[PDB]
Amino acid sequence: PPPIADEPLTVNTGIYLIECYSLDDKAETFKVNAFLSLSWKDRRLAFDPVRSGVRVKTYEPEAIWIPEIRFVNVENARDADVVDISVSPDGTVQYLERFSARVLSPLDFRRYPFDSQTLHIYLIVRSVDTRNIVLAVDLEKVGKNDDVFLTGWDIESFTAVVKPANFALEDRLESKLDYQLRISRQYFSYIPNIILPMLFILFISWTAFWSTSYEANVTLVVSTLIAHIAFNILVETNLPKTPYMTYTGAIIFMIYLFYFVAVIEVTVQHYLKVESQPARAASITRASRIAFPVVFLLANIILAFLFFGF
Amino acid sequence: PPPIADEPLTVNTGIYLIECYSLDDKAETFKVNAFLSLSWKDRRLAFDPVRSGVRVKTYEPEAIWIPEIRFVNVENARDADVVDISVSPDGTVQYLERFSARVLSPLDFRRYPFDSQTLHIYLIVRSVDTRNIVLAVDLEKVGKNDDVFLTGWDIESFTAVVKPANFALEDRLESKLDYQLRISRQYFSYIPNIILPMLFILFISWTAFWSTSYEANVTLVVSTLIAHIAFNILVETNLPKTPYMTYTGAIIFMIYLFYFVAVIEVTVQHYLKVESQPARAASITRASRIAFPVVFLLANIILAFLFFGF
Amino acid sequence: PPPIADEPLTVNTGIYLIECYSLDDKAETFKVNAFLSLSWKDRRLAFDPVRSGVRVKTYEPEAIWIPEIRFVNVENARDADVVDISVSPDGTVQYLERFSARVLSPLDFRRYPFDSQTLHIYLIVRSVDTRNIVLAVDLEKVGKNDDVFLTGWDIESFTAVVKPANFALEDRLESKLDYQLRISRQYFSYIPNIILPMLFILFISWTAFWSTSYEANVTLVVSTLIAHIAFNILVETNLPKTPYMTYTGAIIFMIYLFYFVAVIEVTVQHYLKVESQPARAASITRASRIAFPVVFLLANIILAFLFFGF
Amino acid sequence: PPPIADEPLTVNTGIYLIECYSLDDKAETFKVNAFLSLSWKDRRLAFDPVRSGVRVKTYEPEAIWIPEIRFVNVENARDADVVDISVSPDGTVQYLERFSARVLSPLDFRRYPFDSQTLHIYLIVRSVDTRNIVLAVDLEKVGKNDDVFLTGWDIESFTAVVKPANFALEDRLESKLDYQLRISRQYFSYIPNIILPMLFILFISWTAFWSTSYEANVTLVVSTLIAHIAFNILVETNLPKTPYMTYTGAIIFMIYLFYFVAVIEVTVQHYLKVESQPARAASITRASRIAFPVVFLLANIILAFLFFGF
Amino acid sequence: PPPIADEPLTVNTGIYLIECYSLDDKAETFKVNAFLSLSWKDRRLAFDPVRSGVRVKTYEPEAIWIPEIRFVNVENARDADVVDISVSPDGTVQYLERFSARVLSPLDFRRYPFDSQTLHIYLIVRSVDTRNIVLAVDLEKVGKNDDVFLTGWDIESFTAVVKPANFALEDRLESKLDYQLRISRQYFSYIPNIILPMLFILFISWTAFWSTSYEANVTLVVSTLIAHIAFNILVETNLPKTPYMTYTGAIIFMIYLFYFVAVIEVTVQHYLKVESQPARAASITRASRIAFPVVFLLANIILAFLFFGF
Ligand SMILES: [As]
């Protein structure tokens, strides 16, 4: 039983994020728990303040015609309990629900440990015989407590795209809004726990430049290469199969190289030190002790710049 | 209260994928969230446009007779909220729901990291005393937004098998349709993270051809063999118990060999270098330095061709 | 409001497996999704074909008296949607539902990787003041599509025990039926991934029979023993705490031995080669190179026979 | 509408375990699926056998006043379907439901692999204006089929504490009963898979007493220490964070010691054999070959006795 | 149909924790199962004790006006069954439900293994045309049995913030309460299983100060570094991505250092003992045998103090 309008009925929206949590990098989802604030003029039930009752008259959902406001990017049906419905004199309705649903917004892992994200919530609404345009009411969109959690992420701002995008979808126009949750990552636990430990093993790796014992040079370069796999695998697990290249995926892989040429050197410092030409060997070994850390720190400036600086 | 027909009542179907996600290779399932569009002539409620009401008349599901359209390959009951029902003059009904259910479609891991898949959604419908044939309406089957996600997979096309397959199941004919979601994998994160690291350790493995120290040769070939298990196990975990052989399961196992004969060589380069016959030893060792990488790259062309090229 | 009988009312059952999946070895359960077909004479609503209506008259569950058919070995309440109810003239009722519930049937892991299983579904029914006997109608028990999945298992046959087992349970006789799902395992992925890799490490283990370097013999026998734990642990995890002995649990453990006496030998080949008695040492070492693989392959014939052959 | 009594109305209880399963040591819970048998005199609906109807009259739950019998230690609401209600002449009611709920009973891991447990189910009932005392009827408490499963546990007995415990909880007396499920563990798969493998590695550990090569002694004692972690971690995972000490937690940790002093010895057998005092070294090494296994087997009798014997 | 008041209607709250469990450090949540006790004066249904019925009159929820009391920090809708409603003469209502919901309270891992926590449950309530203030009734808040479980945590006290916090949220004041669950961890299983084993490997690490064999010194310091990753990874897994530094994350990382300079020393004890200057080498090595354990135990006092002592 929809509201007999004279033009496209505007529905007024708003989201008050109450709780954020379980942002799942692998799955590219996250769970939210918020208020949904809707409103519209249904002149059809305006109501003579003086003549009867009081200021505003409370209805149960069955009584009034309510607009179906579906969330677009949601795993299952949104999970909402209705909080209050308050029809104004002029026929204006004040709806408030408190849904919670896991939302499917994508993430850009291009700078992985040091990335910022922009999550989305959508809200479509389909037309019947009056057209429905949705739009935001910013006093119910200040939505975000001063307690919005979302572990391991700094929450920058909850805003929304005022202008809706109105489609024609299957011979019936819909109207979609864009609610934006912007967050930077709390990179850090990534250093004492990944970045640093990863570097340390790389350095030990090439302690075998000041060494001549092949036995203790392979026991050297090789033992550490293993440990680095232990970190490549640790990192690769809390992170999805990107079709592009991560930052840490870069350096973690560039690392795989300074373990090859490292093992190349120690290997050649020997089919060159049994070839009774230690003239050359400890020439190269002497040299690696510079080329390596330099070319590294150099390619890390080259690499890092290639990602952040551009 | 079914629609008094004169022949098999055609029901017209359609699916607009709104969201795709949680494709689970182990479980061989995936979750979808779409529109379901149905329609049929129930002349029994045609309705004199002029004589009353308006262009089209809205019903609640309880009022009209609606066809039970069950999804075949679904874990639990599909999870659908009804979006609109609009009966036309002639008695034509326009139904639209927005279900979300995890679907059980199988996958072919024969090319694992480089595989393409064809997921299915089914839709049966059982007959009563008028027969029901289902069939697709392609304006509600263009189903797939321009945002269909499905992480780590490229989505190629959402189509469907126009011709239904009508069974006789328990003295009552059913009619089933086939909705096809075709996707290729985003192989890649499989290289910097599996393929390459896996290769590197294999190479270092057989650096012990330019070496004579047994101690540093087993410390050599053996250390890396371990690391390779660390990758065989990593890979074997995000992948189900196929009764056939995966591609990466092949090469990952062919790899287990070039670690055995590698260990064979270093082992014989010694019961042959203590047998005061280093004549022979550093003949073999010298040789392995070719046989190995060749036979490998050879068996990789042999292997790769055996999977992709045929 | 039960059917006024003259003797024990027979209820006629039937299950059409539509989907099988999530067989969980650890949990000893599995999920099924099937049809449930029931039928009985309730003469009390026989209905004068000519005098009124038509051939068969459709009821909603609230209208008719229906027998409670509970599933015995089920985790929670069975999860069923009712598909059709069709009362015949004589008063015969035709009921059909489409339940899905995870079933708790036990498994016998005595031959683990090479085992066949017989899963059960039960169906009791309690009496009131007429006795209820259940029994099977085999045209609705041909239940099993030609698509019954159940990953990593070959499905041999869906049958059922015609004769019911009628208990007296708490001063009211019940009647239980036995629906049997027989499946063999797809042992195989167990070879390239467990059996073979497990053997290979055992072999390398005792390459240290053709060796004299204690350093590279412990680096030898010992490194492999580790790797075998890596497999004992892998296997032990996808498998419950049996009070009996698995097959692979046997050989996996018999393996632990050929790594002890292996380590025993290498160890004695030395407190006997420093005891300036290499007379004896390279007598034993020479010998082990036979005793071991023989006694193994011998005890594997002895073991294998002990499980399968008996 | 409760039963007008003259004193505390006795409600008669009973539980027929139909199915047991998913005992979860980590979570300290388990799932059961049983019958619940209740009964009480509601003289208020006694009913003139001859004057009307028959021997006993069947009611739907809505018709009669039924006592709320909540289970105390249950995760969520118990999940029950009602099986039959049969009011006797005198006004006696016969109630039977078939619930299934996961129960939260605690476990005592003090003897871990060799422990026996006593699981509980509770049943309270709150009073209104007549007091409710619950009590057991032992013909509906013989509850336990001859098929009660519960994998990896031997089921010893299903009994119950006849005398209820009546509390005063919030100005209204409740009455609670105690249903006892006693089970011993099927320790065993713990030997071929944990105990034995764990010992074997410990023994090889100290094969390095009959050795002099430091390289092969660290490669010896150390390699095995790792493997033992692989077991400590395996065990620690299928077992919760006890505030007390497990049995296997003891020996698994006492083991950590015989790997330290083991490594201590091999280490000192060398800063004492390079100190040109091999006089002493192979005095100690000689000695360890006894002290160790003895002190172990000694501390294992000391330890084992400390747990089981007391 | 709300209670015609003369001022802000006070609603009187109370929570009796019946069960605690599944505290999930990763997810920062936990499940509770408690009583919820509400009460308020609805003079509108006061009821002439003598004139009719009895002392107190029982209602079903549909009959009375009940306040919506939503829990704030909850994943999904709270899961509550209603236990009793008892309206007093004066019009006072006595409500009791038994909900169970997983709650989202944050945790402070700054002292990880030795941390104490303060979990929250919230309860808001929105106003309509009479204002709603909530407040606690402490005889129904003594909520916590003498069996409150919560594995691996010592439960210190269940209390609540008497004074509510009244917001203005979207043109309608709400009122929120704070129920506090305080718990210390059962650190301990963290010692025999993490702390101690972690230390032991560190010590063995630097046994290679009383050694001169580079081969057995890298086989020494390096083997253990690996094992330490095995612990860093074990610990890092049962713990979320803190933006701050854990205690065990500190020492676990400070440990990474005493493995670097350890490896630095053994490495320099050699490009200095081949440089025919063993004058210096076994000067340094001699020294490390003190500097290390001291600087450690020193930096552990420095570190530990930095977390607990401040
Ligand atoms: As090693």
In chain B the domains, ranked by start, together with CATH numbers, are 1-189 (2.70.170.10), 190-310 (1.20.58.390)
Between CA A94 and CA A39 the distance in angstroms is 5
CA distances from D213 to A31, D207, D269, D289 (A): 59, 12, 10, 16
Q: How many CB atoms sit inside 10 A of residue D118's CB?
A: 14
- What CA–CA distance (Å, rounded) separates D151 from D136? 28
H-only helix segments in chain A: 196-205, 214-237, 247-257, 260-268, 278-304
Helix (H, G, I), strand (E, B) or coil at D136: strand
Size of interface B-C (CB pairs under 8 A): 92
- Residue pair B208/B220 in contact (Cβ under 8 Å)? The answer is yes
Best of D214, D238, D264, D274 to substitute, by most chain E Cβ atoms within 10 angstroms, is D214
**How far away is chain D from the Cα of E227, in angstroms, using its nearest Cα?**
7
Q: In whole angstroms, what separates CA A37 from the centre of its chain? A: 25
First and final CA of chain D: distance in angstroms? 56
**Which DSSP letter does residue C126 get?**
B
A61: how many CB neighbours lie within 10 A of its CB? 11
Question: B250 in helix, strand or coil?
Answer: helix
CA distances from B25 to A147, B76, D14, D92 (A): 37, 19, 46, 57
Question: Residue E206: phi, psi to the nearest 5?
Answer: -105, 25
**How far apart (Å, rounded) are the C-alpha atoms in residues A258 and A254?**
7
Strand extents, DSSP E, chain C: 9-13, 15-24, 29-41, 57-58, 81-87, 92-98, 100-103, 116-121, 132-136, 153-168, 173-185
φ, ψ (nearest 5 deg) of residue E189: -55, -10
C-alpha B195 – ligand 1 centre gap (Å): 23
Determine contact, residues A227/E226, Cβ cutoff 8 Å.
yes
Question: Which residue in chain D has the smallest CA separation from C237?
Answer: D234
> What phi, psi does C84 have (nearest 5°)?
-175, 145
Q: How far A226 CA sits from the closest chain B CA (Å)?
A: 6
Residues of chain A neighbouring B60 (CB-CB closer than 8 A): none
Q: How far apart are CA E166 and CA E177, in angstroms?
A: 9
> Strands D92-98 and D81-87: what pairing?
antiparallel
Chains that touch D (3 or more CB pairs under 8 A): C, E
Select the residue of B170, B214, B240 nearest C151 (Cβ to Cβ). B240
DSSP percent split of chain A into helix, strand, coil, nearest 5: 35, 30, 35
Which residues face D181 on adjacent strands? D119, D158
Per-residue burial over C239-254, b = 16 or more CB atoms within 10 Å of its CB, e = otherwise: bbbbeebbbbbbbbbe
CA separation for the pair D285, C267 (Å, rounded): 14
Alpha helices in E57-213 (DSSP H): 196-205
Query: Quick one: which of E237, E301, E253, E250 has its CA closest to E110?
Result: E250
Q: Which residues of D touch E83 (CB under 8 A)?
A: 68, 70, 126
Distance CA E145, CA E163 (A): 24
How far apart CA B184 and CA B155 sit, in angstroms, is 7
Q: Give the C-alpha separation, B213 to A215, whole Å.
A: 7
Q: Which residues contact C143 (CB under 8 A, 6 or more apart)?
A: C14, C15, C16, C17, C34, C35, C158
Residues 6+ apart with CB under 8 A from D163: none
- Find, in chain B, the residue whose alpha carbon is nearest to that of C153: B243
Beta strand segments in chain B, E: 9-13, 15-24, 29-41, 57-58, 81-87, 92-98, 100-103, 116-121, 132-136, 153-168, 173-185
SS3 label, residue B165:
strand
CA distance E165 to chain D (A): 27
Q: For D216, which of C77, C215, C226 is closest by C-beta distance?
A: C215
DSSP state of A126: B
Resolution (A): 3.6
Calculate Rg over the CA atoms of chain B.
30
H-helix or E-strand containing D19? strand D15-24
Task: Count Cβ atoms within 10 A of the Cβ of residue D201 and give its class: 0-12 exposed, 13-18 middle, 19 or more buried.
Answer: buried
Alpha-carbon radius of gyration of chain A: 30
* Alpha helices by DSSP H, chain B: 196-205, 214-237, 247-257, 260-268, 278-304
Partners of B74 in beta bridges: B103
- Amino acid present at D125: V
Separation between Cα atoms, residue B96 and residue B81, nearest integer Å? 9
Verify whether the Cβ–Cβ distance A225 to B140 is below 8 Å: no
**What does the alpha-carbon distance between residue A24 and residue A117 come to, in Å, rounded to a whole number?**
13
Are D21 and C2 an interchain contact pair (Cβ–Cβ within 8 Å)? Answer: no
Mutate which: D110, D170, D237, D244, vs E, most E CBs within 10 A? D170
Q: Which tokens hold the place of C112?
A: 């683990």
Min Cα separation A149/chain B (Å): 24
Helical ranges in D206-307 per DSSP H: 214-237, 247-257, 260-268, 278-304
Distance C258 CA to ligand 1 centre (A): 21
Strands A81-87 and A92-98, by their bridges, are antiparallel
Rounded Cα distance, B274 and B268, in Å: 10
Backbone angles phi, psi at A260, to 5 degrees: -95, -55
Do E21 and D104 make contact, defined as CB atoms within 8 angstroms? yes
The distance from CA C222 to its chain's CA centroid, rounded to whole angstroms, is 36
Q: Tokens at residue D162, please?
A: 């006849």
Neighboring chain C residues of D54 at a CB cutoff of 8 Å: 129
Closest Cβ–Cβ partner in C126, C213, C267 for D210: C267
**Chain E closest-CA separation from residue A138 CA (Å):** 10
DSSP one-letter string for D191-213: IIIIIHHHHHHHHHHGGGGS---
**3-state secondary structure (DSSP) of residue D182:** strand
> Do residues C83 and C56 lie in contact, with contact meaning Cβ atoms separated by under 8 Å?
no
